[PDB]
Design a binder for these strands. Sequence first.
RNA 1: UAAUUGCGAUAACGAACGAGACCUUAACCUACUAAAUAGUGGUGCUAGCAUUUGCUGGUUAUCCACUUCUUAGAGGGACUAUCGGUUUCAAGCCGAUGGAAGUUUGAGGCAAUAACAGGUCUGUGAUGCCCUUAGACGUUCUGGGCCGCACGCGCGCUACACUGACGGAGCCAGCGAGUCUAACCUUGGCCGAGAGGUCUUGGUAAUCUUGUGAAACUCCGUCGUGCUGGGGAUAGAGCAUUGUAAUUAUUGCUCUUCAACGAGGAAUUCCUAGUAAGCGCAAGUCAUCAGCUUGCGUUGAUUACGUCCCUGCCCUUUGUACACACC
Lengths: 63, 145, 141, 206, 70, 143
Amino acid sequence: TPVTLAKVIKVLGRTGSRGGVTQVRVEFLEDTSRTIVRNVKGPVRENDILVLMESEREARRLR
Amino acid sequence: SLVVQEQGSFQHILRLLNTNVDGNIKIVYALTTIKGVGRRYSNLVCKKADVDLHKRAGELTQEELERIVQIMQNPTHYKIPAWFLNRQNDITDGKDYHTLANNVESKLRDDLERLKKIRAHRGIRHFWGLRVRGQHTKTTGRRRA
Amino acid sequence: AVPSVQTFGKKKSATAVAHVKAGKGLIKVNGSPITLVEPEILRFKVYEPLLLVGLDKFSNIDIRVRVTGGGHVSQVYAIRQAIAKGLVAYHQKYVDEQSKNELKKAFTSYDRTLLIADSRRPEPKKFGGKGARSRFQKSYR
Amino acid sequence: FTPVVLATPIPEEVQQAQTEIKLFNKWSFEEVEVKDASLVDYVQVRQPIFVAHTAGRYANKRFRKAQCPIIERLTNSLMMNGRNNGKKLKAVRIIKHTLDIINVLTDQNPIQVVVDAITNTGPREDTTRVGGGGAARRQAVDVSPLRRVNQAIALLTIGAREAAFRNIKTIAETLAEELINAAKGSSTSYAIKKKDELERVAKSNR
Amino acid sequence: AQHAVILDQEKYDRILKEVPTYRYVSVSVLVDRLKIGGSLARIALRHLEKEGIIKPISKHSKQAIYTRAT
Amino acid sequence: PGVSVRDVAAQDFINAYASFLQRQGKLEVPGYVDIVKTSSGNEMPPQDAEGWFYKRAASVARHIYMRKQVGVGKLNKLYGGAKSRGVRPYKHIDASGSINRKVLQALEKIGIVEISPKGGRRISENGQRDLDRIAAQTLEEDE
RNA sequence: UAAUUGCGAUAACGAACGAGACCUUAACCUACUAAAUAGUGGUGCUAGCAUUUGCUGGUUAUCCACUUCUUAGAGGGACUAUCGGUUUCAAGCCGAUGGAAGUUUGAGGCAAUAACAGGUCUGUGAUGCCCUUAGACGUUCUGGGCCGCACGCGCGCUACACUGACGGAGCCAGCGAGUCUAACCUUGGCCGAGAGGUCUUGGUAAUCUUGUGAAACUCCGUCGUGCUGGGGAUAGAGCAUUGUAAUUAUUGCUCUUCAACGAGGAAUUCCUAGUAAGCGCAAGUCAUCAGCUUGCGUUGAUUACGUCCCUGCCCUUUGUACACACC
């Protein structure tokens, strides 16, 4: 079970056709100041711990 | 509250009045499976010929069961109110009748026959195989508590 | 002559009306000892005002409530509210303020509409539908 | 732990818990830590409650839904199907019964077990269907802690319900079974099965 | 017809034996092993309560609930 | 179908009495009782069978107790089942009022209740001192 | 910004309607005005089950005291109020504080200009032209029919079963409505399994019906997985009511047939809070009949709090061989 943490520092906005998915700037304690643009399904604010399966990803703007 | 025991005298799936009384269930309901007896009537019968109503149908003496049978066949002279019977008042002899067993269906057919013979409208509907009650004609019929 | 106060509690259309005075302890309702009440599950709701602050402060007083309107849960909510408000008001008049403040803060932190009433009230039904926002089904074909 | 006398009789069996620190009737909100990372916000436990009724308004602002007590949320989730819409009393009753059942099997705090089940059963990854306009697949995304909680509760309640439906086991029993199974990686539970399904199907997008 | 309704003889003895070995007991558990029907399950449960053996943390009908003697 | 038991010992409050009313040897059964549905919108008779009338006696004793003064029509309204016709869900509908009347007529005889001004019927001071005191003595015994 | 709402910019300048404002209603006034047609408390007469003084009535009479609840009248009250952020730092927006109320506080009513050859001559002694006018499509009496049908399509409301259905012990409401030149709403006592019948009584109504002690649901017992017991159709037989008249059964009850049905392809309807959903209740038609609607409460969820992809709407730019306007 490879698991990684992710604290949300900013939320760029709603994305996708239906708009039930949000672009989020996640950042974790395992080496701070290293960031990803991740897509989140549910409702998200500042200081929300997300459970990541993989670190190396780049969630790009849905079309 | 208290657990009984008993032995191999228990006889499930016994029969009475051309029909099989179902074992391993309460006696009232077991009776109810008979054509011509339903729930309320069965309960009444049980109350009259005093069976222990918690006890199942597969137990109990044959003399008792024949008392029940006697009651079922001969209700009005065993002090049963005479508003309770299914074919109440009747249209031949002019006395109350609880039609029972497979005879009820036969009796029903006889009624349905006499109607057609008479040539009442309802009889004609029956003959045609139509919704006989004069109700709004698009039916199935159901279902609340 | 004797010291006493009276307050109320609301929920939907349920209305509870309390009476408090200086006595021996007695706390009862409509047609109930406060242990029994109804509905056993909810029961503990009626204690909430008594327990959160502490039962020790219901030694010298005598509370008694009567209610009208609503349903069971609603009634319970009303009665508990009445018990609360009646207590705090009693403290306010016949005891010092600091105690009342302590009581409030104990309650208001927990607040299940404990002091203050529930401000939601039934929205009306409108035509072309069984309920308020609900509407009937349409065909096209 | 000092008792107290009063004119009306309040039983000492009941009065004990009332006098001492606050708790669900018998079972306590004390101890009962948040097990997993995340849900240190979106699971309650403190503030405590006597019974899980607490008829306020939660889905109103946006995330006060989170600060609603998790047991009450569970109760709410249990309360549905139309036939069983409203009847919160039934739900709370069955919650209590579930807790009892979870105390009987395995011992320990049943609230803690429930918490564990919640923490496990939320699918850490989840996907959704992109538009396209003809033929498109599931696109891989992350899921929120609140959303994780929501799905956890939903899935447990639904699986428990279906399991009960037309089986001699009551909701109290089936739900309890689901919980106890869901505490660890049992996998025979419905919730965890669904989670697995959601994860494998997610993992089939890279 | 799954049955297991009437007690017979040896099945009562078996119940007497195997009840205290369980952690949890209810009407569902005492029908789960194709044992006694609902009526008897209830009756027998009440009996086992009466005659030591199982300790109630119970409440009401429909959902009955007892535990082992400890 | 019925009213006012939510509070105290719903079943036990009116069970130790039920056998005690038989114990008294004063009760006065209709005769056609115990072969009856108890309501127009019901389906079965009670499962107590050798009893039930004694439950409904203390329940009517409780009814006269309840408040001020009570009548026949009110009792019909109360113990009335509500009637299930076809689709027509469960519209509130009167009871087997005759039974309640019979119960009243019994209770009046036993020295518990009497006919009041403003119509209706009211509890006596001598009345329930002995009747439901022994049944609720179980609550006094446990206490 | 819900909004041609504003802030601003500026060959425009001031203006009018619509929106908003306004009206009713929903909630907060332990302040004013009071109230036996609304309550509560104290004193003479009650303490009979959980009671020692639940709460109740004894108590239209026992007199007094009161207005928190209940009713209204008059006013106050919320203005995004205070704090923080955020923005040419402006209009505004997001969070926090208090607050009964902080989504224009919710809900409605009212709702512009120009249209459609939308519906209605079966609401109208509203009417044009046409038709008919005493074997009259006029008016009226007798008897049918509009209910002719296991449905070819459309809406509609109980619990497919153990968060169940029973047997009881179940169960607090709120809109209403109500007799006169008569027979409406029925309390009360008797009889009746029953529906009902009867003798009367109260009421032109915050007083009497009527705390419409409604239903779902709280508590124990009865089944417990089985087109069975769960609950009482389709067909028969009787007994009631309403009405000149019930027959192609008006309704209601009673017993016998026993059925909430095996979670409903493709498809498509409504839904974001006291809502959806559950559940009854009254009124509207009414002699009688509700499953119809119109309101009312009761229990009370999940899930967003977003987007323009589908279905459409508004504006601006543009393109147009269209203008009965992309059918």
